[PDB]
Design a binder for this molecule. Structure first.
Ligand SMILES: Cc1cc(Cl)c(OCCOc2ccc([C@H]3CCNC[C@@H]3C(=O)N(Cc3cc(CNC4CC4)ccc3Cl)C3CC3)cn2)c(Cl)c1
Ligand SMILES: *[C@@H]1O[C@H](CO)[C@@H](O)[C@H](O)[C@H]1NC(C)=O
Lengths: 162, 171
């Protein structure tokens, strides 16, 4: 229990900060915003129709390419101002920096064109609490805490200027 | 260029200076703290009787309620467009400091911290890194301190002690 683990972020235009995670075996990589204002992990699903603009320019998670994927299928929905974000629960191995964690996440099958088509990243890693988690899905940082590998139960953000 | 960095299990001293100052969460379950004021220049225009602040790393801007931001912008001379607020680019560098009263400290953003200075011309309009967003209950009504804030203040989210720590970011 002596590790700190870091993730380099990309700054897009002072409005979007994102870095890389890997989902599955072998790892399918995704750019994600690490968001203290939400508690879920979401990535687009290979099951998102190409008739959704937000899905056509982003990386899609494919369960049928992962050997460590465990099906769940519970439909879950996020209520956004521009429309509904919906998808379903899946479990797989998520790598963040030097850390591997088995995690439940949502695979998105539909989402409003806006603002999602304007994101340079593919998904979100929620860093908030189980209390605000849709479906009371255990947040990733809670699964990292449970591992007892961290030096401290903290995480920190640096954001540069562009 | 290094766009940013998240550390899990610690912080990175090469990216902040001095020591952290901490504020306790209002209630566990959300990364929200008490705010005790917002100063334009040296006068406390807003949140004079305390309000809430969400420390939201997934937000681009500092946000307040429509009423609070109407008032903030009225004081900055900023004009409401459809989505954002703007100023004539030439007045950008003369905009007053804005301070957020959090814990024992004032967190001061200068104009360079919140004006998108894409030009210095009076014929051009420059955007502000502050927007109005009405966040519905339970979380809100609340301010949200997004990237605009985090850029200036290295932020630590502490689950062990249920606190948020701010130190001056080293760029
Ligand atoms: C391409 C893509 C993007 C996403 Cl988020 C995604 O996950 C679906 C999950 O949906 C969402 C949507 C909003 C949120 C907000 C919750 C609180 N913080 C800001 C977040 C916020 O506004 N954004 C969205 C956002 C923020 C900004 C930055 N500017 C806005 C002022 C914040 C720009 C674009 C987008 Cl789409 C969350 C944190 C990323 C969380 N999850 C999937 Cl499956 C695919
Ligand atoms: C999906 O996982 C959750 C665990 O919280 C559970 O409530 C639900 O029953 C699961 N769905 C399945 C596999 O039936």
């Amino acid at each position: 229990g002596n590790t700190t683990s870091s993730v380099i972020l990309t700054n897009y235009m002072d409005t979007q900060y994102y870095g890389e995670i890997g989902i599955g075996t072998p790892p399918q990589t995704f750019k994600v915003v690490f968001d203290t204002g939400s508690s879920n992990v979401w990535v687009p699903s290979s099951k998102c129709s190409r008739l959704y603009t937000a899905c056509v320019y982003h990386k899609l998670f494919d369960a049928s390419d992962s050997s460590s994927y465990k099906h769940n299928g519970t439909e879950l929905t996020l209520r956004y101002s521009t429309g509904t974000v919906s998808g379903f629960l899946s479990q797989d191995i998520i790598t963040v920096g030097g850390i591997t964690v088995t995690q439940m996440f949502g695979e998105v099958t539909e989402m409003p064109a806006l603002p999602f088509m304007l994101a340079e990243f593919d998904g979100v890693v929620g860093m908030g609490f189980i209390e605000q988690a849709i479906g009371r899905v255990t947040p990733i940082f809670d699964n990292i805490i449970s591992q007892g590998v961290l030096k401290e139960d903290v995480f920190s953000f640096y954001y540069n200027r562009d | 260029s290094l766009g940013g960095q998240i550390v899990l299990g610690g912080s990175d001293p090469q990216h902040y200076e001095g020591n952290f100052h901490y504020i306790n969460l209002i209630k566990t379950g959300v990364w929200q703290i008490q705010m005790k004021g917002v100063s334009v220049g040296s006068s406390t225009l807003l949140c004079e009787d305390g309000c809430l602040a969400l420390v939201d790393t997934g937000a681009s801007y500092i946000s307040g309620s429509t009423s609070s931001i109407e008032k903030l912008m009225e004081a900055l001379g900023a004009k409401k467009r459809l989505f954002d607020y703007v100023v004539k680019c030439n007045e950008g560098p003369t905009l007053p400091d804005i301070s957020f009263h959090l814990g024992g400290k004032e967190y001061t953003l200068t104009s360079a911290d919140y004006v998108f200075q894409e030009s210095y011309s009076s014929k051009k309009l420059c955007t502000l890194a502050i927007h109005a967003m009405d966040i519905p209950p339970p979380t809100g009504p609340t301010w949200a301190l997004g990237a605009t804030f985090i850029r200036k203040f290295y932020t630590e989210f502490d689950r062990r002690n249920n606190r948020i720590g701010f130190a001056l970011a080293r760029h």
